C-alpha cells in the first residue's frame, strides 16, 4: 500500500470510523429496512465506509485519489438523496469536515 493509501487506511478511515456520527455509514444503505423510497434508483454508485475499508484491505485502489473519490461519493450520495437539515445530512456534514481536515494533513505525494 502506497504511502498515501496507507494514511487513508490507518488515519482517515480509522478516525472516521471512531467518530460518533459514523455508525449509519458503516454498512450498505438498507433502503428497505430504513424505509428510504427510491434510494437505489437515485443513487447510481452506492458507497459506505465498510466498502472503502475492504477496498483498502484488498489493494483495490491504484492511487490515493481513487480512494478519496469513494469517500466523496459517500458524502455526495447523502446530500443528493436526503432533505437538507435531515439528521443524517447534519451528521454527514460533520463527518465530512473531519475527512477534509485529515486530507489537509495527509503526507504529500
Ligand atoms: C435518538 N436518535 C437520534 O436522534 C438520531 C436519529 C438519526 C436518524 C437518521 N439516522 C439513520 O441511521 C437512519 C437513516 C436515515 C436516512 C439515511 N439516508 C441515507 O442516505 C443513508 C442512511 C444510512 C440513512 C440512514 C441516523 C440517526 N439523530 C442523531 O443522533 C443526531 C446526531 C447529530 C445531529 C446533528 C445536529 C445538528 C448538527 C450536527 C449534527 C443530529 N442528529
Residue numbers in the entry: 28 to 136
List sentences quoted exactly from the publication behind this structure.
The BRDT-BD1/CDD-956 crystal contained four molecules per asymmetric unit that are very similar, showing root-mean-square deviation (RMSD) values of >0.5 Å between shared ∼100 CA atoms. These four domains all show very similar poses of the CDD-956 ligand contacting the KAc (acetylated lysine) binding pocket and a neighboring hydrophobic groove. The methyl-quinoline binds to the KAc pocket via hydrogen bonds directly with the conserved asparagine (N109) at the BC loop and indirectly with Y66 at the ZA loop through ordered water. The piperidine-amide linker interacts with the WPF shelf and the αC helix, and the amide forms a hydrogen bond with D114 at the beginning of the αC helix. The phenyl-pyridine docks to a shallow hydrophobic groove between the αZ and αC helices. The midnanomolar affinities of CDD-2107 or CDD-786 suggest that the methyl-quinoline and phenyl-pyridine moieties of the S species likely interact with BRDT-BD1 like the R ligand CDD-956 in our structure; this would point the methyl-amide of the S species toward W50 rather than toward solvent, incurring steric clashes for many of the possible rotamers of this substituent.
pmcBRDT, a testis-specific bromodomain-containing protein, along with BRD2, BRD3, and BRD4, are members of the bromodomain and extraterminal (BET) family, and each protein contains two tandem bromodomains. In analogous fashion, it is the first bromodomain of BRDT (BRDT-BD1) that has been shown to be specifically essential for fertility in mice. Here, we demonstrate the discovery of a DEC-Tec inhibitor series that is both potent and highly selective for BET BD1 subfamily members versus BD2.
